[model samples]
Target chain A: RTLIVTTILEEPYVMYRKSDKPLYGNDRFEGYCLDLLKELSNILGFLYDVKLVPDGKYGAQNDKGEWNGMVKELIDHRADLAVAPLTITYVREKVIDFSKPFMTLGISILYRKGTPIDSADDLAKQTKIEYGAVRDGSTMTFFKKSKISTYEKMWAFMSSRQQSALVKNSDEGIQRVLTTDYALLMESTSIEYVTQRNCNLTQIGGLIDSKGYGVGTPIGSPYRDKITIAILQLQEEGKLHMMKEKWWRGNGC
Target chain B: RTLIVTTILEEPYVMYRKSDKPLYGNDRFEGYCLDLLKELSNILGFLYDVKLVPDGKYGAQNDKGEWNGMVKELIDHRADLAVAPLTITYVREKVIDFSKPFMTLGISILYRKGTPIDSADDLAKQTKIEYGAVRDGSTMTFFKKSKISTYEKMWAFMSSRQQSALVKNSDEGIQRVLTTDYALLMESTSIEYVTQRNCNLTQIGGLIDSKGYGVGTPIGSPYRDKITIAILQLQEEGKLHMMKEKWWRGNGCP
Candidate 1:
């Protein structure tokens, strides 16, 4: 039986335990990815265990070709795969092999109900509008690239502030934008979920672009094929959408 | 005096008296393009006459190679050059030689302050979000080709409404979106001007891409070289920026 491992950050995705007792593979950490692994296990007949790893170390360990702590427990041949909504950008793709995109998403802007700014051009033309996003998110990248002219001076007109007060999720971003003129940039899915749950806010526009969230596995792992096949079957059977709706619907953040 | 006739539209670009009063170019109509033409004529050492042409027939006359409208006025040897905000897209480019991009701009989205939508992405995700732009404006093209997966669904959703409220200008589209949940897509320049004037509204984001405006002349017109050189000179001397700022900032759109 191939042992599988997973690491998750706490939120609507994974609820972390604050207790003194180490909680590994507990209900607190159980969510969409957990449910997905369980279903995959049922199909593949794999002996797998879900363990909690420090969220901060997950990316670094994955980069080093070594998983440490809970992730290391897997690296020592104790587990086979990690199932989570692990984001797979080009940079991360080098360290991890991700399944086909299970979720499509992108970063979006959220402004206060009455802010004068409406579109990116307004922001560019006027210097007074203040916009911000999390320190290192795709929205910042979008702002940097969406310039009208080849001249560098055009970029200087509109700027993004990296504020410590900036929130990690779309709900917090929307909340921040609602109370202030400062606009918030965050994931489209998170923004949509929050807007749906809270009638006060609405997704300002369509997604900036599509990004993919996928299950992550160690590079050159033997289980990659099996995991990929399982994901495909789940997608083809409409089970993936059902799983998404079951886990994501109404959570709103 | 070489009768170098010029053709201009009647609206804001060029105004005309209904009676056959000898056409005299007004300050507003003769402002920027005429100024540029005067400078070009000075450089080319030619005396030019600016004529007012009926609005609709200019392009068709130009296409028919007849001396009826603006391009016809030129081709029929009645005019020497055509100077206006005549856009130089690839289709127009095939028949005319355009000076260097006199202005660069494109369509953008405009929405109210509290609109749930922020960027194109938000519009794509929500099944009910309705968006519209000028019927044939670049913004409509952007809506058609937006990367958002649900754009087609949104388009189909708005098919009935789109047929009726197809707009002609940025102001019309912006006004429609401001009053309704639907977001307005329009030229960046127009959106910029409207947002500047209407403090209550703001342009949501910059255009998805960049496009330019240029002065159009007939293909192989001898004056193309002189006009192109003048444009380059104005650009280097910072006069072009001044001109844009003059029209965009000082003179509110008519």
Candidate 2:
């Protein structure tokens, strides 16, 4: 009953605004995660309310050794569920429960137009704005490897600069990337899904690697496996994918 | 059918063991990839021969726009299959095919101990070595993309603009760190493996991107679906990640 579901407006995954009229409860929003959550409740017969992650991050651990954003919301039990396109990663699964993949994609570049930077190859060509990945999720872990690698190569390149800010989530990344010299190194599908709606925003390069998005629950939530099987059946029947097209096929504009 | 499996012998993945006897052919090699190939052949019922890529790089594009390495082998049909931990990405899937993932990992830093480099934050305090990254890999892409966001406030600090310390692969970057003033950016698992052997090399920070390594083949290969099912069965039985522990538990995954 009245499950407080967490999310960030990660385009195509979850998108909403205050209802223009007296819209009550769930009617205040619409998007991919919204529809998926609506469908799951229909199947599972549960009551829920939507809430945004207080810090507005996809989720990441700070250097101070504490988790923040949407991922932490589930961990802190501040929300009963995460009804958004959070990735199902080994690191995250160590802390939370994820269902069978509802959708799949990879990491890539999200940059504003007029940047001339199209792919990772063009990196040496410029260096002006600070770059960032999500804080505590898969992307953040990729950056923090004890050994030097891509994330750090950028860190070595970007950190030596004036001042770059680590963003809380896709929205803030977009807030800057949608119009600036800033770029967001993030999941490809999110950019593609987001680009359909925003004119100035675009994904510049090919994916860095692949990943899956799953419904998230607290580490010990009883709902974890129960909903996963439901997801698999819909996948086999093709309705879950069909729903993706139905909801995401149109631009948010 | 002759399955020409393409791979690079990286440490435990495809290790070479030279014995005094007349051992030859597949017997000359052993490691994770070799064992995995053996298992897949057992389930799939096919005879395969291992072939090394001329260049050891995983896969990347040349400035001339030509593809090379294991991915290139598949694209050129030089190899019938790839049994190694080739990554599955949208950019690669365009030219080759990938089965369902057999392994999952992410990009991280590879550094040496006592190098005074503990994290990217540490890179800020120094002035030695150009920034190093693979030229055509995800790390390269990430660097180019992250090249700057703070130029507005600190454009003056990073104007050094690394001349694209672009190395051929993760290994080259690691090698550079062993002697040169470079810090190699690469996958965390690779760091895990390297740190175990050399003790000097270390993974400095955390991951930047997450990915799955999949069986690769030429585009639309007939083996794609069948091998994918085998990988799934392996995962269902817990062999996939189990293998990761065996090969990479101490930093394995050849």
Candidate 3:
């Protein structure tokens, strides 16, 4: 039986086709995740196919065993696994069984160099500062539900600016910090890469909150055990670090 | 007028010598502080002499202006300045004027390679972990005041055999962690040096917090302004970092 996998068009993770290219068994569309899937297929001896689904459609499709988009494709049983930076949160955990976290990260504030915001404490005290995050994304959800109370004080102090939902990727979020006085809250890994590459930007402080990303499978997929072992084996051989570096080396987001 | 400086017998800081040939003047001692005194003398255009004094008696004699000890020599108009690692805490500040801090440091914990304790959290959880610090030094003061609430509780839980003071210098402290199960805590800079020299030992965490060392003087001395300016100039020109690196390169306090 062929196992179908659903994924979104995230750069360095998965790229989408502009032309009529074969969705599965293609090199460009199947980047890091594809490479890992090949390794898993070798070990588990399972035939698998990858298909692109629109963002946010993987979840519903996974539930109904019908493929609509990447998210829906997974929920509908049309896909065996969803391999993306599918963030593992409490709510998502109820619907999907995630393999051990492939990556752990924290939320952080990125701002232009020479901004008065130096630490969380500094951010909390300033009123002129404006911040933004992607709409309907994990970062937005984190900002809304963030337990980092210090940011609340900062929000209260600052004269509010428009909360733009226009950011589409980590690169956009970082660009906002570099080109404007505005600050954006994003994953530490993204912010760190941006700050490291661009000398003019700085990460304001340590992580405001912690979370992890993991591979998602149907609630009781028989493949869970196999997937978990594959992930752990990758961790031991230091492939996790290698994979992250390969994807993120110059992306700076 | 010559300035009389009071110093202690701390190695690599100050020492007492009884060589048959008198090693008079500043030649009697050598280290960071001695070099600092030489610079200060040049800047202020004054002659200064180094006098060895017992650790505890220097301050009292300095206060009384009686020619009994090193401080007395300075106060009784025999000398003019005191240059030592003579810590300038608030209590001492009440009796003497201090220049801006020259070096800052804190106490730290050291343990052998295989010691189970890795952090203060580890020390708090284990009832069997026996930890020790110098009897009357800054480390003991830190242990008494450490923010970790469970430390006293852990101490109470230790067997009576594990409960006691180990009257030892930091060297002995390092030896204890290596030979016995006890962990050692001492002045941070000293531990940094010891740990660097012996790869088997490591400092666990920062302890007592303090600002830089300051030059001590009578509360109202004309020399304070000149000394502050000299220190600021040294700092701006990166001379302080250069001097610190020269002295601490193999010692490893940073």
Better of 1 and 3 by TM-score: 3
Candidate 1: tens digits of C-alpha lDDT, residues B1-254 = 66454655522234444544554544334555666666666766787667665544434323454334455555555556777655434334444555545555555677776555667667656655567666543345444544444455545544565465456565467667767767776667667767766666777766544444555566667566456556645543446656655555633323
- State the lDDT of candidate 3 residue by residue for B122-226, as single tens digits: 765764656767654434533443444555544343324644635346556667778877776566666766767777878885553433356766656777546
B30 Cα displacement, candidate 2 (Å) = 1.9
Give a tens-digit lDDT track for model 3, residues A1-253.
Answer: 9888777765556765455755436444755666677777876788877766645533422345443444445455767988876665544554555655556666687887775577767756664556666554565654454444665554433324444433656778777777766777777877766776787887887875545566777766778646755664554344666677776676343
TM-score of chain B of each: 0.69, 0.79, 0.74
Cα miss at B153, model 3 (Å)?
42
Candidate 2 chain A TM is 0.80
Q: What is candidate 2's lDDT per residue for A202-228, written digit by digit as tens?
A: 788786554678888897688875566
Worst 10 residues of 1 chain A by lDDT: A146-155
In model 3, which regions exceed 4 Å deviation?
A: A16-25, A56-71, A151-162, A251-253, B1-254
Ranking by TM-score: 2, 3, 1
Which stretches of candidate 2 lie above 4 Å from their native place?
A1-253, B21-23, B114-118, B121-126, B134-138, B144-172, B249-254
Candidate 3 lDDT: 0.60
Clashes of each: 31, 43, 26
Evaluate residue A32 in candidate 3 and report its C-alpha lDDT on the 0 to 100 scale.
65
- Give the per-residue lDDT digits (tens) of candidate 2, residues B127-242: 56445566666555545444343211122233235544667666677788888766776766677778877776677777544555678889758887567667655653446655
Give the DockQ of candidate 2. 0.03
